[PDB]
Design a protein around this motif. Structure first.
Motif, short mmCIF file in Angstrom:
data_model
loop_
_atom_site.label_atom_id
_atom_site.label_comp_id
_atom_site.label_asym_id
_atom_site.label_seq_id
_atom_site.Cartn_x
_atom_site.Cartn_y
_atom_site.Cartn_z
N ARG A 41 32.93 -2.21 -17.19
CA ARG A 41 31.98 -1.16 -17.03
C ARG A 41 31.19 -0.87 -18.34
O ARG A 41 29.96 -0.63 -18.27
N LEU A 42 31.87 -0.97 -19.47
CA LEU A 42 31.23 -0.83 -20.79
C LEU A 42 30.25 -1.93 -21.01
O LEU A 42 29.06 -1.69 -21.46
N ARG A 43 30.58 -3.19 -20.70
CA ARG A 43 29.69 -4.30 -20.82
C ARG A 43 28.40 -4.08 -19.97
O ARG A 43 27.22 -4.27 -20.45
N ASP A 44 28.61 -3.71 -18.72
CA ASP A 44 27.47 -3.61 -17.79
C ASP A 44 26.54 -2.48 -18.18
O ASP A 44 25.31 -2.72 -18.24
N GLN A 45 27.10 -1.33 -18.56
CA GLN A 45 26.33 -0.17 -18.94
C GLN A 45 25.73 -0.35 -20.32
O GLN A 45 24.55 0.05 -20.58
N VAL B 17 43.43 -0.88 -15.81
CA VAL B 17 42.37 0.06 -16.19
C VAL B 17 41.64 -0.37 -17.46
O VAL B 17 40.47 -0.12 -17.62
N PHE B 18 42.32 -1.10 -18.35
CA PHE B 18 41.70 -1.59 -19.58
C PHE B 18 40.63 -2.59 -19.31
O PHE B 18 39.49 -2.50 -19.81
N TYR B 19 40.97 -3.64 -18.54
CA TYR B 19 39.97 -4.67 -18.21
C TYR B 19 38.77 -4.08 -17.51
O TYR B 19 37.62 -4.40 -17.80
N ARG B 20 39.07 -3.19 -16.53
CA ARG B 20 37.99 -2.60 -15.72
C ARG B 20 37.08 -1.73 -16.60
O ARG B 20 35.84 -1.72 -16.37
N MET C 30 39.22 -8.20 -22.31
CA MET C 30 39.22 -8.98 -21.09
C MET C 30 40.14 -10.22 -21.19
O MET C 30 40.46 -10.80 -20.12
N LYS C 31 40.53 -10.63 -22.38
CA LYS C 31 41.54 -11.68 -22.54
C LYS C 31 42.97 -11.10 -22.53
O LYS C 31 43.80 -11.61 -21.77
#
Length: 121
Positions: free
Chosen positions: A101-105, A94-97, A86-87
Protein backbone atom coordinates in the motif's frame (compact mmCIF):
# COMPACT_ATOMS: atom_id res chain seq x y z
CA UNK A 1 33.74 30.51 -4.25
CA UNK A 2 30.45 31.79 -5.31
CA UNK A 3 29.93 28.75 -7.59
CA UNK A 4 30.26 26.50 -4.42
CA UNK A 5 27.70 28.62 -2.59
CA UNK A 6 25.26 28.34 -5.50
CA UNK A 7 25.65 24.55 -5.56
CA UNK A 8 25.04 24.55 -1.78
CA UNK A 9 21.86 26.60 -2.19
CA UNK A 10 20.56 24.12 -4.82
CA UNK A 11 21.28 21.24 -2.33
CA UNK A 12 19.41 23.14 0.35
CA UNK A 13 16.40 23.70 -1.87
CA UNK A 14 16.42 20.00 -2.92
CA UNK A 15 16.54 19.10 0.80
CA UNK A 16 13.46 21.25 1.41
CA UNK A 17 11.55 19.57 -1.38
CA UNK A 18 12.65 16.02 -0.21
CA UNK A 19 11.51 16.85 3.32
CA UNK A 20 8.01 17.61 1.98
CA UNK A 21 8.13 14.38 -0.10
CA UNK A 22 9.25 12.37 2.96
CA UNK A 23 6.35 13.77 4.99
CA UNK A 24 3.85 12.90 2.37
CA UNK A 25 5.24 9.31 2.01
CA UNK A 26 5.27 8.73 5.71
CA UNK A 27 1.61 9.77 5.90
CA UNK A 28 0.91 6.77 3.71
CA UNK A 29 2.15 4.56 6.63
CA UNK A 30 -0.41 5.39 9.25
CA UNK A 31 0.38 2.23 11.21
CA UNK A 32 4.02 3.46 11.66
CA UNK A 33 5.30 0.09 10.45
CA UNK A 34 8.24 1.73 8.65
CA UNK A 35 8.94 4.55 11.11
CA UNK A 36 11.95 3.03 12.84
CA UNK A 37 14.73 0.48 12.15
CA UNK A 38 13.93 -3.17 12.64
CA UNK A 39 15.25 -3.93 16.14
CA UNK A 40 18.09 -6.49 16.17
CA UNK A 41 17.21 -7.20 19.77
CA UNK A 42 13.67 -8.25 18.70
CA UNK A 43 14.61 -9.77 15.28
CA UNK A 44 18.10 -11.11 15.92
CA UNK A 45 18.49 -12.87 12.54
CA UNK A 46 17.48 -9.76 10.50
CA UNK A 47 20.85 -9.02 8.97
CA UNK A 48 21.20 -12.57 7.77
CA UNK A 49 18.18 -11.85 5.57
CA UNK A 50 18.36 -8.15 4.76
CA UNK A 51 21.72 -6.68 3.83
CA UNK A 52 20.79 -2.97 3.65
CA UNK A 53 18.06 -2.19 6.25
CA UNK A 54 16.18 1.07 5.87
CA UNK A 55 13.37 3.00 7.62
CA UNK A 56 11.91 6.52 7.69
CA UNK A 57 13.89 7.69 10.74
CA UNK A 58 17.14 6.67 9.08
CA UNK A 59 16.13 8.52 5.90
CA UNK A 60 15.21 11.62 7.92
CA UNK A 61 18.72 11.65 9.59
CA UNK A 62 20.35 11.46 6.14
CA UNK A 63 18.08 14.15 4.77
CA UNK A 64 18.75 16.59 7.62
CA UNK A 65 22.47 16.25 7.03
CA UNK A 66 21.80 17.11 3.32
CA UNK A 67 22.88 13.63 2.45
CA UNK A 68 20.69 13.12 -0.64
CA UNK A 69 22.39 14.71 -3.69
CA UNK A 70 19.57 13.96 -6.08
CA UNK A 71 16.04 12.43 -6.08
CA UNK A 72 17.40 9.03 -7.33
CA UNK A 73 19.34 8.55 -4.08
CA UNK A 74 16.24 9.33 -1.99
CA UNK A 75 14.12 6.94 -4.06
CA UNK A 76 16.69 4.20 -3.65
CA UNK A 77 16.30 4.40 0.14
CA UNK A 78 12.48 4.47 -0.08
CA UNK A 79 12.48 1.43 -2.31
CA UNK A 80 14.71 -0.37 0.24
CA UNK A 81 12.04 0.14 2.91
CA UNK A 82 9.41 -1.50 0.71
CA UNK A 83 11.58 -4.17 -0.90
CA UNK A 84 13.22 -5.36 2.38
CA UNK A 85 9.76 -5.81 3.93
CA UNK A 86 8.37 -7.69 0.94
CA UNK A 87 11.28 -10.19 1.15
CA UNK A 88 11.36 -10.72 4.93
CA UNK A 89 7.63 -10.93 5.42
CA UNK A 90 5.15 -13.25 3.64
CA UNK A 91 2.26 -12.14 1.47
CA UNK A 92 -0.36 -12.93 4.08
CA UNK A 93 1.07 -10.55 6.70
CA UNK A 94 0.09 -7.04 7.77
CA UNK A 95 3.73 -6.01 7.15
CA UNK A 96 3.85 -7.09 3.52
CA UNK A 97 0.43 -5.62 2.84
CA UNK A 98 1.44 -2.26 4.42
CA UNK A 99 4.45 -2.21 2.11
CA UNK A 100 2.32 -2.80 -1.00
CA UNK A 101 0.00 0.00 0.00
CA UNK A 102 2.94 2.36 0.74
CA UNK A 103 4.50 1.54 -2.63
CA UNK A 104 1.25 2.16 -4.55
CA UNK A 105 0.36 5.39 -2.73
CA UNK A 106 3.96 6.63 -2.69
CA UNK A 107 4.33 6.19 -6.48
CA UNK A 108 1.83 8.98 -7.01
CA UNK A 109 3.84 11.38 -4.76
CA UNK A 110 7.13 10.45 -6.36
CA UNK A 111 5.82 10.89 -9.92
CA UNK A 112 5.10 14.57 -9.20
CA UNK A 113 8.31 15.02 -7.19
CA UNK A 114 10.32 14.03 -10.22
CA UNK A 115 8.52 16.57 -12.42
CA UNK A 116 9.24 19.33 -9.75
CA UNK A 117 12.89 18.42 -9.42
CA UNK A 118 13.35 18.55 -13.22
CA UNK A 119 11.16 21.65 -13.66
CA UNK A 120 12.88 23.83 -10.93
CA UNK A 121 16.32 22.27 -11.76
Amino acid sequence: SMEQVAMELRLTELTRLLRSVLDQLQDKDPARIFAQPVSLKEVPDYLDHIKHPMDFATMRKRLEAQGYKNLHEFEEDFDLIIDNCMKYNARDTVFYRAAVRLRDQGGVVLRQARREVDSIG
